[PDB]
Each structure stands twice: as C-alpha cells, then as structure tokens.
Amino acid sequence: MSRAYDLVVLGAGSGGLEAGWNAAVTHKKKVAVVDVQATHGPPLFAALGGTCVNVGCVPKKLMVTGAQYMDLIRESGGFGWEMDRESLCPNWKTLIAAKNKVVNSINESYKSMFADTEGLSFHMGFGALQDAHTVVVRKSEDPHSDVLETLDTEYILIATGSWPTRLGVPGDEFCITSNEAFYLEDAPKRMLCVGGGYIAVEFAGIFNGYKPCGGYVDLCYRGDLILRGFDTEVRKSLTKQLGANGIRVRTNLNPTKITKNEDGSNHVHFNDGTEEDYDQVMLAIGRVPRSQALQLDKAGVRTGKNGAVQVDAYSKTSVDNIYAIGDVTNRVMLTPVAINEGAAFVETVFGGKPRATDHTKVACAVFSIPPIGTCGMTEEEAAKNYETVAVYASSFTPLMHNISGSKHKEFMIRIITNESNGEVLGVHMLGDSAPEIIQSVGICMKMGAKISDFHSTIGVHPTSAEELCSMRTPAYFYESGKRVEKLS
Amino acid sequence: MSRAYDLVVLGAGSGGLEAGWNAAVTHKKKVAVVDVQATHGPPLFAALGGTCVNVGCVPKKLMVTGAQYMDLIRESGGFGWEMDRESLCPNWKTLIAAKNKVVNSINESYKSMFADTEGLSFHMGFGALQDAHTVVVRKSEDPHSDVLETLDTEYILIATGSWPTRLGVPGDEFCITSNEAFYLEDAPKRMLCVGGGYIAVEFAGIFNGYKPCGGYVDLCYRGDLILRGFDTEVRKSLTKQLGANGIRVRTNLNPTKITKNEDGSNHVHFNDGTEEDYDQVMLAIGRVPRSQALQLDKAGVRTGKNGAVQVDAYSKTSVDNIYAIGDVTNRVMLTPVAINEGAAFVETVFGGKPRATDHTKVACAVFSIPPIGTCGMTEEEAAKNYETVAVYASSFTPLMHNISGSKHKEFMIRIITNESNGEVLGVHMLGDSAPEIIQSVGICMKMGAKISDFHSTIGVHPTSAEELCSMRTPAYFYESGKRVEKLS
Ligand SMILES: Cc1cc2nc3c(=O)[nH]c(=O)nc-3n(C[C@H](O)[C@H](O)[C@H](O)COP(=O)(O)OP(=O)(O)OC[C@H]3O[C@@H](n4cnc5c(N)ncnc54)[C@H](O)[C@@H]3O)c2cc1C
Ligand SMILES: Cc1cc2nc3c(=O)[nH]c(=O)nc-3n(C[C@H](O)[C@H](O)[C@H](O)COP(=O)(O)OP(=O)(O)OC[C@H]3O[C@@H](n4cnc5c(N)ncnc54)[C@H](O)[C@@H]3O)c2cc1C
Ligand SMILES: NC(=O)C1=CN([C@@H]2O[C@H](COP(=O)(O)OP(=O)(O)OC[C@H]3O[C@@H](n4cnc5c(N)ncnc54)[C@H](OP(=O)(O)O)[C@@H]3O)[C@@H](O)[C@H]2O)C=CC1
Ligand SMILES: NC(=O)C1=CN([C@@H]2O[C@H](COP(=O)(O)OP(=O)(O)OC[C@H]3O[C@@H](n4cnc5c(N)ncnc54)[C@H](OP(=O)(O)O)[C@@H]3O)[C@@H](O)[C@H]2O)C=CC1
Ligand SMILES: N[C@@H](CCC(=O)N[C@@H](CS)C(=O)NCC(=O)NCCCCNCCCNC(=O)CNC(=O)[C@H](CS)NC(=O)CC[C@H](N)C(=O)O)C(=O)O
Ligand SMILES: N[C@@H](CCC(=O)N[C@@H](CS)C(=O)NCC(=O)NCCCCNCCCNC(=O)CNC(=O)[C@H](CS)NC(=O)CC[C@H](N)C(=O)O)C(=O)O
Numbered sequence: 001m002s003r004a005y006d007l008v009v010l011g012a013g014s015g016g017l018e019a020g021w022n023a024a025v026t027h028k029k030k031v032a033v034v035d036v037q038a039t040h041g042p043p044l045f046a047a048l049g050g051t052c053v054n055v056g057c058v059p060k061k062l063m064v065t066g067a068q069y070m071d072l073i074r075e076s077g078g079f080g081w082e083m084d085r086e087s088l089c090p091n092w093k094t095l096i097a098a099k100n101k102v103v104n105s106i107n108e109s110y111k112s113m114f115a116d117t118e119g120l121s122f123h124m125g126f127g128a129l130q131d132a133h134t135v136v137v138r139k140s141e142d143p144h145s146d147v148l149e150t151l152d153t154e155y156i157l158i159a160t161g162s163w164p165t166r167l168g169v170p171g172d173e174f175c176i177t178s179n180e181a182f183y184l185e186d187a188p189k190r191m192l193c194v195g196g197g198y199i200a201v202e203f204a205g206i207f208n209g210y211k212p213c214g215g216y217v218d219l220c221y222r223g224d225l226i227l228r229g230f231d232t233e234v235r236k237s238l239t240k241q242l243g244a245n246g247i248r249v250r251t252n253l254n255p256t257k258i259t260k261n262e263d264g265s266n267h268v269h270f271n272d273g274t275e276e277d278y279d280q281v282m283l284a285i286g287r288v289p290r291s292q293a294l295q296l297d298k299a300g301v302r303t304g305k306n307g308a309v310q311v312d313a314y315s316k317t318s319v320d321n322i323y324a325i326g327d328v329t330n331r332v333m334l335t336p337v338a339i340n341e342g343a344a345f346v347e348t349v350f351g352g353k354p355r356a357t358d359h360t361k362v363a364c365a366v367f368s369i370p371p372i373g374t375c376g377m378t379e380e381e382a383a384k385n386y387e388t389v390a391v392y393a394s395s396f397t398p399l400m401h402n403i404s405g406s407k408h409k410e411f412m413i414r415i416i417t418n419e420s421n422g423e424v425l426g427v428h429m430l431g432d433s434a435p436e437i438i439q440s441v442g443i444c445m446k447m448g449a450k451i452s453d454f455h456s457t458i459g460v461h462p463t464s465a466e467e468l469c470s471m472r473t474p475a476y477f478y479e480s481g482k483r484v485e486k487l488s
Numbered sequence: 489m490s491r492a493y494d495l496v497v498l499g500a501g502s503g504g505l506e507a508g509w510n511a512a513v514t515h516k517k518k519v520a521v522v523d524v525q526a527t528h529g530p531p532l533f534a535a536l537g538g539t540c541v542n543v544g545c546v547p548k549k550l551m552v553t554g555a556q557y558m559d560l561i562r563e564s565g566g567f568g569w570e571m572d573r574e575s576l577c578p579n580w581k582t583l584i585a586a587k588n589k590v591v592n593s594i595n596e597s598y599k600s601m602f603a604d605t606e607g608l609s610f611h612m613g614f615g616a617l618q619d620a621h622t623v624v625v626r627k628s629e630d631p632h633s634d635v636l637e638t639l640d641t642e643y644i645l646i647a648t649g650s651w652p653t654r655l656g657v658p659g660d661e662f663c664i665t666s667n668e669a670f671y672l673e674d675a676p677k678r679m680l681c682v683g684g685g686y687i688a689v690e691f692a693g694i695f696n697g698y699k700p701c702g703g704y705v706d707l708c709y710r711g712d713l714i715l716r717g718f719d720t721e722v723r724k725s726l727t728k729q730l731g732a733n734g735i736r737v738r739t740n741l742n743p744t745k746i747t748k749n750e751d752g753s754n755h756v757h758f759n760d761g762t763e764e765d766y767d768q769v770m771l772a773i774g775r776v777p778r779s780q781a782l783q784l785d786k787a788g789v790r791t792g793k794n795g796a797v798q799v800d801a802y803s804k805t806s807v808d809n810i811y812a813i814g815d816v817t818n819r820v821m822l823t824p825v826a827i828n829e830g831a832a833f834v835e836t837v838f839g840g841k842p843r844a845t846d847h848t849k850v851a852c853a854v855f856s857i858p859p860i861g862t863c864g865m866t867e868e869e870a871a872k873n874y875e876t877v878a879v880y881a882s883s884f885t886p887l888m889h890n891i892s893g894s895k896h897k898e899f900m901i902r903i904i905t906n907e908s909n910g911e912v913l914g915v916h917m918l919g920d921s922a923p924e925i926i927q928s929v930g931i932c933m934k935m936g937a938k939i940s941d942f943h944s945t946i947g948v949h950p951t952s953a954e955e956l957c958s959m960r961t962p963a964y965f966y967e968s969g970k971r972v973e974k975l976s
Contacts, residue, residue: 052949058887061950065888066567072560073569078586079554080579080698081561087571094568098891105890210568336947336954358946365948373948399546400553402593403586436921439953440928443945447935457931458846460853460861461540461823462549465927 004152006350007031008135009159010127010294012110013050015326015338016159019345024119027350031120032151034127034137039107040100045179048110048122051161051327052335055179059103063182064202064367066095067209071245071369075404092187092210099182123149129156129299132319141293155321157345158309159338160294162287162327171258174266175283178203188280189215192268194255196221196228198366200284201242205369208247218276220250227366231379231414231428233393234372238430241370244408255281289328305330313356315345334364363442365435370409373438376426376445379416383478388419388487392451393475394467398431411464415451415471422450427468437465492640494838495519496623497647498615498782500598501538503814503826504647510834512607517838519608520639522615522625527595528588533667536598536610539649539815540823543667547591552690552855554583555697559733559857563892578698580675587670611637617644617787620807629781643809643837646797647826648782650775650815659746662754663771666691676768677703680756682743684709684716686854688772689730693857696734705734706766708741708758715854718862719902719916721881726918729858732896743769777816793818801844803833811837819847851930853923858897861926864914864933865904871966876907876975880939881963882955886919899952903939903959907975910938925953 006029009020016033024031037047040054047054073088114122125137125148135156137149164177176184178199189212193204200219208217219226219242226249227235239249257269258281265279291307302310302318308330315323323345326338340357348354363375376382383389392415401409411431417424427441444453451471459466477484497508500523512519525535528542535542561576602610613625613636623644625637652665664672666687677700681692688707696705707714707730714737715723727737745757746769753765779795790798790806796818803811811833814826825845832843851863870877880903889897899919905912915929932941939959947954965972 057950061887062567062891066564066569069560069564069567069569072557073564076554076557076561078582079557080582080586081554081557082577082579082582083575084572087575089570091568091570094566094570098566098568102887102890335949340946362946363948365951367950399550399590402590403550433921433924435948435951436924436953437928439948439951440925440932440956442948443937443942443957444928444932444935446945447932447937447941449931449935453935454931457934458828458850459824460851460923460927460930462545462855463853463923463927465924466824468927469931 001154003133003154005030005032006153007155007157008127008151008153009033009157010135011035011050011159011161011326012048012122013046013159013161013326013338014052014335015050015161015342016157017048017050017110018339019157019159019325019342020120021113021117022343022346023350024117027346028119029350032123032153033120034123034125034135036126037124038111040103042183046161048107050335053106054103055182057335058106059099059182060202061367062099062102063095063206066090067206068369070209071406075406078403078405089212090187090210092184095210096183123151125149126293127160128293128295129301129322131299132156132321143293143295155349156323158291158294158317158322158324158328159326159342160290160328161338162333163290163292164283165285165288166283167285169256169258171266174258174260175281177283181282184280187212187215188278190265190278190280191215191217192276192278192281193217193219193284194282195284195286196223196226197284197286198227201227201238201366201368203282203284204242204247205245205367208245208369216248217246218248218250218278220253220255220270222252222254224251226251229378230366230372230374231426233379233414234374234412234428234430237395237410237412238368238370238372241408241410241430242368245369247369287327287333289330291328314348314354315341315357331359332362332364334362337362358446361442361445363438363445365438367435370430371432371434373429373434373436373441374427375438375442376424377416378426379414379428382416382418382425383481386418386425387480389425389478390417390419390451390474391415391476391478392417392471394471396467398464399462411467413467413471415454417451417474419477422452424449424451424454431464433464437468441468489642491621491642493518493520494641495643495645496615496639496641497521497645498623499523499538499647499649499814500536500610501647501649501814501826502540502823503830504538504645506827507645507647507813507830507833508608509601509605510831511838512605515834515838516607520611520641521608522611522613522623522639524614525612526599528591530671534649536595538823541594542591543670545823546594547587547670548690549855550587550590551583551694551698554578555694555857558697559894563894566891566893578675578700580672580698583698584671611639613637614781616781616783617789619787620644620809631783644811645830645833646779646782646805646810646812646816647814647830648778648816649826650821651778651780652771653774653776654771655773657744657746659748659754662746662748663769665771669770672768675700675703676766678753678765678767679703679705680764680766680769681705681707681772682709682770683772683774684711684714685772685774686715689715689726689854689856691770691772692730692735696857704736706736706738706764708738708743710740710742712739714739717866718854718860719866719914720868721902722860722862722900722916722918725883725898725900726856726858726860729896729898729918730856733857735857775815775821777818779816802836802842803829803845820850822850822852825850846934849930849933851926851933853926855923858919859922861917861922861924861929862915863926863930864912866914867902867904867966870904870906870913871969874906874913875968877913877966878905878907878939878962879903879964879966880905880959882959884955886952887950899955901955901959903942903956905939905962907965910940912937912939912941919952921952925956929956
C-alpha cells in the first residue's frame with residue numbers, strides 16, 4: 001500500500017496548516033493541504049492561514065488596538081496633552097485599508113512558504129470525502145460541481161473549523177456577521193451587535209471606537225447577563241464599564257423581524273415588541289462546526305450535535321486513519337489549541353512517540369475594550385465538583401486613572417482555590433494588560449500552583465500584576481456548594 | 489524592663505511603614521514611626537510614605553505614562569486617527585500639578601491612618617541614636633539642634649533608605665538629581681541626563697516626552713554600554729531603540745566642569761574635552777545608603793562600604809535589638825523587597841515564628857520608554873557558576889507596528905537555562921507590557937521552573953507573552969563558561 005500523499009489536510013487553518021507543515025519538514029512525509037482560496041476574501045472569507053489569520057484573531061486584534069486609541073487620546077488630555085479635541089476624527093477607511101495591507105502580506109508569506117518547502121503542496125478547492133483514502137477536490141461546495149483533483153492518501157485530517165450561526169427569523173439575510181464586519185466599506189453610525197459572546201463584545205468595542213458623530217452602539221442579548229462562562233463578578237463589572245464607555249447594553253432582548261427602508265438602513269423589531277433603526281446589524285450568535293458539505297456520511301465519520309466531528313483524546317475519528325482538529329471537533333475553540341491538537345497528532349502518528357492535549361487550565365482572553373484574562377474553573381463550577389473552596393477578591397483602580405479622568409477602569413482579580421489543599425483552580429482578571437499577565441498565570445496553574453505559591457513571591461512595585469501576590473485572607477468561602485462566610 | 493515603645497521605626501519608608509503598621513495592628517505592640525516631614529516636599533524631599541511614594545516609583549510612573557503618550561498619539565495617526573499634527577503640545581505644568589494632586593492625596597490618606605490606628609504614632613524630626621534602647625528626635629541633621637523628643641524603646645528599625653550620589657567636580661552643585669527633577673518649574677528644552685542607571689534612563693524617557701519644540705535629550709555615561717547588570721543583548725537593543733526614539737545616547741563620556749551662563753543655562757565640559765549648553769543637567773550616579781547622619785557609632789552598629797548597615801539574613805544588626813531594612817542595607821534596593829524584609833522582621837521578632845527573605849529570583853522592572861522585564865541570572869553569570877547552560881532567544885516585531893509606523897519597537901525575549909537540570913535561571917524581556925508579564929514569570933521561577941515547563945503550556949493567542957511557551961530550539965550554549973553552538 002504505497003499511496004500518492006502521506007497526508008491530506010482539509011483546511012489551511014491555524015490547526016491544519018501547523019500539522020501539514022510539521023509532518024513535511026521534521027518527518028518529511030508527503031503532505032497536501034486543501035483550502036478554499038488564495039488570500040483573505042470578500043466572496044469566500046477564510047483562506048490560506050485559517051479563520052484566525054483572515055477573519056479572526058489577527059485582523060480583529062488590529063481593529064481593537066485602533067479603537068482603543070479613542071480612550072487613550074481623550075485620556076492624554078489630563079496629562080497635559082492639549083490639542084484641538086475636535087481636530088479629531090477616526091477614519092475607518094484608512095483602518096481597513098491598512099488592515100488589508102497587513103493580512104495580505106501574511107497571505108503572501110504563506111504562498112512563498114509552499115514554494116520553498118519540499119513535501120508541501122497547496123491544493124485549492126472544496127474538499128470532500130469519497131472514502132477513507134480518497135479525497136475529492138471540487139470547485140463548488142455544491143456536490144454536483146466539477147471534479148478538479150482526486151488525491152490518494154494514507155491519512156486525512158479535517159481542519160475546516162467553524163462557521164457563523166445565523167438565527168432563523170424574517171430578515172435574517174439583512175444582517176451581517178463577523179465575516180462581513182471586516183469588509184464594511186464605511187463606519188456604521190447607528191449600530192446593533194446581537195448576542196453576548198467573545199465576538200459580540202469585542203466587536204461592540206470596535207464600532208464604539210470608529211463611530212462618527214452622533215453614532216452609537218447597542219448590544220442586545222437574549223439572557224440577563226453577558227458572556228456566560230466567565231467569573232460572574234467579572235461579567236457584571238464589564239457591563240458597567242462598557243456602559244460607561246458608551247456601549248448601550250440591553251439584556252433579555254432579542255429581535256424577531258428585520259426589514260429594509262427607503263434609505264437602505266435596516267429596521268429592527270424586538271422581543272419586547274419595539275422598533276429601532278440601525279445602519280447595520282451584526283449577528284454574533286456563535287459558530288457551528290463546518291462539516292455541512294464534507295460528506296462524512298459517504299466515508300463513515302460520526303457527527304454529533306450540529307456536525308461536531310467526534311474524536312478520541314488523540315484527535316482520531318470513527319475511522320482508524322481519519323482525524324479532525326480545531327473548531328470542527330467542538331472542544332474548546334481557540335487558535336493555540338487547534339495548534340496543539342495538530343502538533344500532538346504529528347508526534348503521535350508520524351513521530352511514533354504519541355501524545356494528547358491538555359484541555360483544562362487553558363488560559364484564554366476576551367479582547368473587549370477592557371480586556372479579560374481568565375484561566376481555570378469558574379467560581380460556580382469549582383464550587384460544584386470541589387468540596388471546600390475559597391474566593392480571593394481584589395478590585396483596585398490604578399494610579400493613572402485619577403488623572404486620565406476614567407475613574408471607572410478599575411482593575412479586577414478573582415482567585416478560586418481548593419480550601420482542602422490550597423490549590424489554585426481559577427484566576428480571573430478584568431483590566432488593561434490582563435491578557436498579557438494571565439498567560440504566565442496559565443503556566444503556573446498547569447504547573448499546579450497554590451495560593452501560597454502566589455503571595456510568597458516578591459513583586460514588581462508599580463505593576464498591576466503585583467497585586468496577584470497580595471491576596472492572603474480570602475473574601476469568602478464555598479462549603480460543599482453553598483454561600484458561606486466562616487468554617488467552624 | 490517595661491519601656492514606652494515596643495518598637496521605634498526610624499523612617500516612614502515603604503519598608504518602614506509596613507513594619508510599623510504590622511506590629512501595631514496584627515500584634516498590637518506599641519510602635520512609633522519617625523520621619524522628616526508630613527507631605528511630599530521640595531525643601532526636604534521624602535516624607536511620610538517613603539522615597540517611593542514621594543520622590544520615587546509612584547510619581548515617577550505617572551510621568552512615564554504621560555511621556556508614553558507622545559508615541560501613542562503619533563502612532564494612532566496610522567490607524568486612521570486624523571487630526572492637527574501640530575495642535576498637539578505637551579504642558580509640563582498641568583502634569584506636575586496633576587502629579588501633586590495625586591501624591592498629596594496619598595500623604596493625606598496616611599495622616600488619617602495614624603489617627604485611626606491604636607498603637608501607631610508619627611513623630612516628626614531627624615532620628616539619631618543615644619544608645620541601644622534610646623532614640624533621639626532632633627529638628628536638624630545638625631547634632632547641635634534642639635532635642636525635640638526622646639523615645640524609650642525595646643526595638644529600633646532603621647528604614648532611612650538611600651540618598652542621591654553626587655560626583656565631585658567643579659559645578660557639581662549646579663546640577664539637579666532624581667529629587668529636584670520632580671519639581672522643575674518648566675519642561676527643559678536642552679537636557680542632559682548623566683549616568684546609565686534605572687533613573688538615568690527612565691528619566692531620559694520622561695523629558696524626551698515633555699520636551700517642547702526643538703528640544704532634545706542627551707544621555708551620557710562613563711562606561712561603554714548602558715545599564716550594566718541586565719541581559720547584555722537587551723542592553724544593546726534598548727540603546728538602539730532609545731536612539732530611534734529621539735534620545736541621543738553617548739557612551740564613554742563624562743563631564744568635568746560645569747559653569748553657569750549669563751542667560752541662566754548651565755555649561756558643560758566633557759571627558760573628551762568638548763563643550764555644550766543645556767538648560768538643565770540631572771545626576772543619576774547612584775544612591776548611597778542614608779545613614780551618614782544617624783550616629784550609629786555612638787550605639788555600636790557597624791557600617792561598611794559607604795555606611796551600608798551590616799545585617800544578617802534576618803535583618804539584625806551589630807546589636808541584639810537593632811535592625812535595618814530597605815535601601816540602607818545595600819542588598820539590591822526596591823520597594824517590595826523592603827516590604828518583605830519589613831514583614832519578615834515582624835513575624836521574626838513579634839510573630840514568634842522567625843523568617844528569612846529570598847533575595848534571589850526577584851522579578852524587577854525598568855520603566856524606560858520601552859519597558860524592561862527581568863528576573864533571575866544574566867547570561868554572563870549563569871555561564872560562570874553553573875556548569876553547562878543554554879540560551880533561548882526570540883525577537884519579533886508585534887502585529888500593530890507595521891501600521892503605527894514604529895517598525896523599531898521589536899519585542900525581545902531571552903531565557904537562560906541550566907542544561908543538565910533544564911532549570912530556568914533567568915528571563916529577560918524588552919517591550920511594552922514587559923513589567924506586567926515578568927511578574928508571573930517570577931512566581932514560576934521561585935516555584936522552580938524548566939524550559940520544558942514553559943513549552944508544555946498552551947497560549948493566549950494574540951499576545952506577546954504567548955511567545956514564552958514557543959521556545960524549544962536554543963540559540964546557543966555556554967559549556968563551562970564558553971561560547972558554543974554544539975555540545976560534545
Ligand atoms: C472573529 C473571530 C475572532 C477570534 N479571535 C480569537 C482570539 O482572539 N484568540 C484565539 O485564541 N482564538 C480566536 N478565534 C478562534 C480561532 O480563529 C479558531 O479557534 C482557530 O483558528 C481554529 O482553527 P482550525 O484549525 O479549526 O482551522 P481554521 O483556522 O478555523 O481554518 C479552517 C480552514 O479550513 C478551510 N475550509 C473550510 N471548508 C473547507 C472545505 N470545504 N474544504 C477545504 N477547506 C475548507 C477554510 O477556508 C479555513 O481556511 C477567533 C475566531 C473568530 C471567528
Ligand atoms: C526616582 C526613584 C524611582 C524608583 N522607582 C522604583 C520602582 O519603579 N520600582 C521599585 O521597586 N523601586 C523603585 N525605587 C526604589 C524604592 O523607592 C526604594 O528601594 C524603597 O523606597 C526603599 O524603601 P525603604 O524601606 O529603605 O524606605 P524609603 O522608602 O526609602 O524611605 C525612607 C524614609 O526614611 C526617612 N528618613 C531618612 N533619614 C531619616 C532620619 N534622619 N530620621 C528619620 N527619618 C529619616 C525618609 O524621609 C524616608 O521617608 C525608586 C527610587 C527612586 C529614587
Ligand atoms: N478567545 C477569543 O478571543 C475568541 C474566542 N472565540 C471562540 O469561538 C466560538 C465562537 O462563538 P462566538 O459567536 O462568541 O459566540 P459563543 O457561542 O461564545 O457565544 C454565543 C453567544 O450568543 C448567544 N446566543 C446563542 N443563541 C442565541 C439566540 N438564538 N439568540 C440570541 N442570542 C443567542 C449565546 O447566549 P447563551 O450563553 O445564553 O447561550 C452566547 O452569549 C466560542 O465558542 C469561543 O470559544 C470566538 C471569538 C473570540
Ligand atoms: N526597579 C526600578 O524601576 C528602579 C530601581 N531603582 C533602584 O535604586 C537605585 C537607583 O539607581 P540610580 O543610582 O540610577 O543608578 P544605579 O547605581 O543602578 O546605577 C548607577 C549608574 O551611574 C553610573 N555611575 C556611577 N558612578 C559614576 C560616575 N562617577 N560617573 C559617571 N557615571 C557613574 C553607574 O555606572 P557603572 O555601571 O560603571 O557603575 C551606573 O550606570 C538602584 O540601586 C536600583 O536597584 C531605581 C529606580 C528605578
Ligand atoms: N497603586 C499601585 C501601586 C503603587 C502604590 O501606590 N504602591 C504602594 C506604596 S509604594 C501603595 O501605596 N499601595 C496602596 C495603594 O496604592 N492604594 C491605592 C488605593 C487606596 C487604598 N484603597 C482603599 C479603598 C479600599 N477599597 C474597598 O474596601 C472596596 N470598596 C470600597 O471602597 C467602597 C465601599 S464597599 N465601594 C465600592 O468600591 C463600590 C461602589 C460602587 N461603585 C457604587 O456605585 O455603589 C497599583 O495599584 O499598582
Ligand atoms: N505575531 C503575533 C502573534 C499573532 C500571529 O501573527 N500569529 C500566527 C497565526 S494566528 C502567525 O501568523 N505567526 C507568524 C508571524 O507573526 N510572523 C512574523 C515573523 C515572520 C518570520 N520571518 C521568518 C524569517 C526569520 N526572521 C528573522 O530571524 C528576523 N530578521 C532577520 O533575520 C533579518 C536579517 S539578520 N533582520 C534583522 O534581524 C534586523 C536587521 C537590523 N535592523 C539591521 O540594522 O541590519 C505576536 O507575536 O504578537
């Protein structure tokens with residue numbers, strides 16, 4: 001059984017690309033990588049690099065940095081930086097323009113990687129499964145399209161990731177998603193972000209920065225508190241700070257109907273039964289795994305709740321040679337996770353020396369206007385399966401914000417510990433420089449640290465991360481899943 | 489042997505206060521704290537709070553943040569932030585004035601602490617020693633001054649800290665120091681910073697931000713590479729980045745003569761034998777421990793190199809009941825170290841259960857224009873008293889700086905490891921958010937850490953701190969104090 005390619009990876013995704021690279025360079029296997037298109041695109045959004053390079057973590061990040069400048073400018077005024085506080089206007093155009101110039105060069109970084117690397121080949125189409133060894137390449141997502149290539153391979157790795165979850169309502173097609181968000185010709189005046197997820201909030205922040213005169217940004221959410229899954233004291237405090245930044249939050253509110261007007265703006269009917277007019281409306285409902293058109297059935301790979309490709313703890317699927325990684329798996333959807341799942345796969349099935357991916361004590365971040373950095377268990381979830389738990393709280397407002405006028409940018413820290421052995425189960429932070437600090441916190445937790453480990457370290461005097469080693473006595477306790485003050 | 493006070497702390501320093509406070513509240517012992525004045529002051533510089541609150545880290549950091557804005561403003565111009573590129577003018581006055589607003593507020597919250605606390609009292613003057621159990625308070629450093637109080641105590645703690653070193657040359661008195669810098673009437677146009685230490689550099693950054701049109705900021709140094717004591721590759725890259733930021737660095741250069749002009753500026757003669765005119769000239773030569781007035785002799789407490797007070801690792805001096813902490817001890821001098829030495833003291837002699845202070849693997853930071861985060865051993869040092877060592881290096885230029893126009897703000901990391909052990913001995917970083925990241929790095933290293941411990945952790949994707957966990961290949965090695973690439 002000598003086949004054409006040792007591996008065929010579906011998706012140049014941050015997870016897919018990593019795996020395909022690794023196998024061909026360290027292990028010198030023949031690898032073929034399939035993806036939709038060449039560079040970041042308006043008709044098909046993802047491409048060489050993955051969801052995060054083209055329509056995610058990379059371009060998004062730049063836009064959050066750009067919008068963040070709004071505050072910095074007004075703030076500097078308090079430090080003696082005087083100027084015409086109305087010479088100032090944000091040019092959404094020069095942003096997207098300069099954003100595109102950057103993504104483009106990463107796409108042009110990859111193109112040359114492929115022509116420089118022996119064993120790697122990029123094949124452009126729409127991957128589908130014929131059987132366990134044969135991958136078909138089509139020019140359409142439509143199965144009736146043209147047979148462009150047919151690749152015979154020992155292994156198949158699905159890294160197609162995820163895709164916006166639209167909501168089925170009248171006017172659903174009138175909306176935009178995170179995808180079209182990035183290619184909006186002009187900055188929205190009256191803006192509605194819908195939902196309450198990482199992306200809903202990050203983006204709310206962005207439009208709030210690049211809004212023109214009289215512009216505003218509403219954020220509506222089905223539930224009563226945004227960002228379900230984070231420290232419920234961090235969630236509450238962000239809401240305040242977003243409100244104080246200009247983002248009008250609206251909870252327990254969800255549209256039913258959307259219709260276009262004579263000016264071309266979009267009109268919105270609500271859950272409470274009211275109507276408002278927005279230039280634009282973005283859906284951030286979540287992301288269903290992207291296996292819709294792959295025909296896994298045709299080759300026998302078991303899907304689950306909405307196409308989630310079920311895998312073991314080593315990324316293997318229903319078939320002994322087919323694999324899936326990244327977001328399509330439905331485990332925690334992040335770039336550096338997909339990367340790890342990909343690299344572990346490589347060591348396992350090509351390095352001979354197997355390996356599996358640690359899913360807990362993974363630190364992630366929310367690049368909202370005041371960034372969030374968490375790692376570990378929630379306050380609630382640690383109180384569920386752990387017997388005795390301690391809560392350490394500390395909310396301070398840094399020195400500079402007495403001057404900058406933003407006396408609301410209060411930095412927050414929450415530490416959740418197992419009272420029994422003192423172990424640190426979850427750290428949660430709200431404030432600037434939060435995603436930066438939390439990173440090394442995650443090393444400390446996979447290390448297996450304890451609250452003692454923290455305060456027993458000497459700090460750096462003017463930093464905000466020093467207040468991590470300053471929480472000795474706990475704020476309160478959870479004795480077998482109940483709200484407690486004492487213990488005796 | 490019942491005495492008036494259990495403790496007399498000789499200096500309301502970072503360490504001074506912490507010590508005094510602790511014993512008075514957690515141990516209810518009677519404490520008296522002696523310092524020079526009440527609020528931050530121009531005639532006598534440090535006051536109730538320490539060399540850090542009044543003429544150190546707290547106000548310093550506010551000014552570094554203000555100078556940081558200059559870049560942030562021009563940088564926003566690339567993100568679409570259009571405005572009058574010359575509406576912008578820094579007002580040095582509104583800064584200093586809003587700086588005092590803050591510092592003064594601290595001094596005001598301290599006053600109220602003393603009135604609020606049973607066992608704590610503030611006594612105002614210049615403390616000297618009468619014997620081992622008697623502290624005298626004078627209204628001058630002059631010993632022929634008036635006896636203002638005389639305190640009968642069981643324990644004395646010397647937290648007088650340190651004091652600027654001037655250099656002995658013609659015109660020495662024409663200069664300013666760390667201290668007077670903070671009260672400069674106006675922003676110095678033609679500016680010279682002298683020496684190559686934390687404050688020499690941090691301050692260089694400050695004036696370079698608040699300089700007015702046409703102004704410049706030179707920096708001269710005796711030696712040929714700035715900041716001896718940090719990673720010799722970080723030291724190089726900073727110099728370059730300062731140069732490119734507007735600061736004219738000059739090595740192997742040291743003034744001899746200073747003479748005032750008939751306009752009011754100061755005139756400078758150099759080591760190379762050249763002449764220049766500067767509006768101001770600030771000395772950042774060093775900080776000699778501040779015991780040169782206390783009469784430790786008349787009590788039997790042994791001074792050393794420049795009055796440094798000799799103490800054991802538990803802070804006890806030549807006498808059984810007298811102690812010294814902070815800068816005056818001449819162990820490496822920072823706020824949180826003085827804080828630890830002071831709290832250790834408390835558990836040691838009042839908590840009953842003794843305690844020592846870990847002086848190594850302390851994470852500190854340099855609040856220069858691009859900040860530095862360092863923790864542990866230098867390259868040159870680990871290459872010495874550790875047999876076989878590895879060097880892990882990685883420099884990247886962050887996502888945003890392709891747009892901001894600062895294609896020179898290259899973030900840098902280098903990790904220093906024991907080969908045999910795998911142990912992480914030193915971590916060094918240059919770039920924005922460095923002091924923040926490094927803090928948790930130091931928790932990891934005191935905890936004992938390995939390069940394998942880093943790359944076994946998953947990352948938070950759009951950060952600079954994530955690049956810590958992506959270093960597997962070493963850049964080169966030190967095989968028993970020798971620069972090598974291979975090993976055998
Ligand atoms: C707006 C947004 C912001 C985000 N921000 C962050 C962040 O800040 N930090 C973070 O850690 N994560 C972030 N993420 C998540 C991150 O992008 C993903 O979790 C991660 O990139 C998933 O990688 P993957 O391996 O599944 O492949 P992906 O990176 O998702 O790429 C999948 C590839 O498969 C291709 N493909 C799709 N269908 C086919 C098919 N039919 N045939 C062949 N190829 C196909 C696509 O073209 C695409 O290139 C963000 C995501 C979004 C949407
Ligand atoms: C400009 C500057 C910036 C700094 N920045 C940082 C930084 O960013 N991070 C960091 O970690 N460290 C920084 N430091 C160092 C830090 O401030 C000190 O290491 C720390 O304050 C030492 O504390 P201490 O316990 O020795 O007492 P100190 O805080 O030094 O205070 C000593 C007190 O004793 C009093 N005193 C002196 N003589 C007498 C006497 N005759 N009688 C009675 N009282 C007396 C003084 O008035 C003073 O209030 C900085 C220092 C300076 C000068
Ligand atoms: N680390 C980062 O920076 C980022 C990570 N991601 C990852 O990628 C995935 C993409 O999800 P993204 O869109 O945030 O959203 P995720 O599902 O987190 O969030 C979805 C949000 O939409 C709400 N929602 C779901 N259905 C409806 C509905 N029918 N009507 C109204 N609201 C609804 C959900 O509410 P409810 O909680 O009540 O169900 C939830 O608040 C996430 O799982 C996340 O892990 C995405 C972006 C950035
Ligand atoms: N962590 C932080 O953010 C900060 C910490 N500090 C601490 O407090 C102290 C303050 O530092 P500060 O005194 O700048 O500098 P520190 O002594 O580090 O450095 C002194 C600098 O002055 C130079 N120098 C000494 N003598 C002369 C001379 N005669 N002529 C010319 N140059 C000379 C030294 O050069 P050479 O190397 O040849 O001796 C050295 O570069 C340090 O001990 C530090 O630990 C201070 C500020 C901020
Ligand atoms: N500050 C720097 C370090 C630099 C520094 O200053 N270091 C040392 C000396 S070198 C130092 O001085 N450290 C102490 C310090 O800097 N403190 C600054 C804050 C002042 C002290 N803080 C007192 C307030 C304590 N807070 C609380 O007890 C919390 N709650 C409240 O104060 C009130 C009453 S419960 N309500 C609220 O907070 C909620 C009110 C709500 N917004 C509403 O609308 O109702 C930092 O944070 O990094
Ligand atoms: N970059 C983000 C993370 C986000 C991100 O981009 N993530 C992923 C995908 S989600 C990604 O795309 N990563 C790739 C990336 O960001 N790459 C940027 C670096 C590209 C690497 N380039 C390869 C070539 C090796 N380069 C070098 O070693 C650096 N320079 C040099 O070798 C040359 C020649 S010595 N010049 C210099 O070193 C400078 C010379 C000096 N200025 C002079 O005066 O001469 C971050 O780090 O914050």
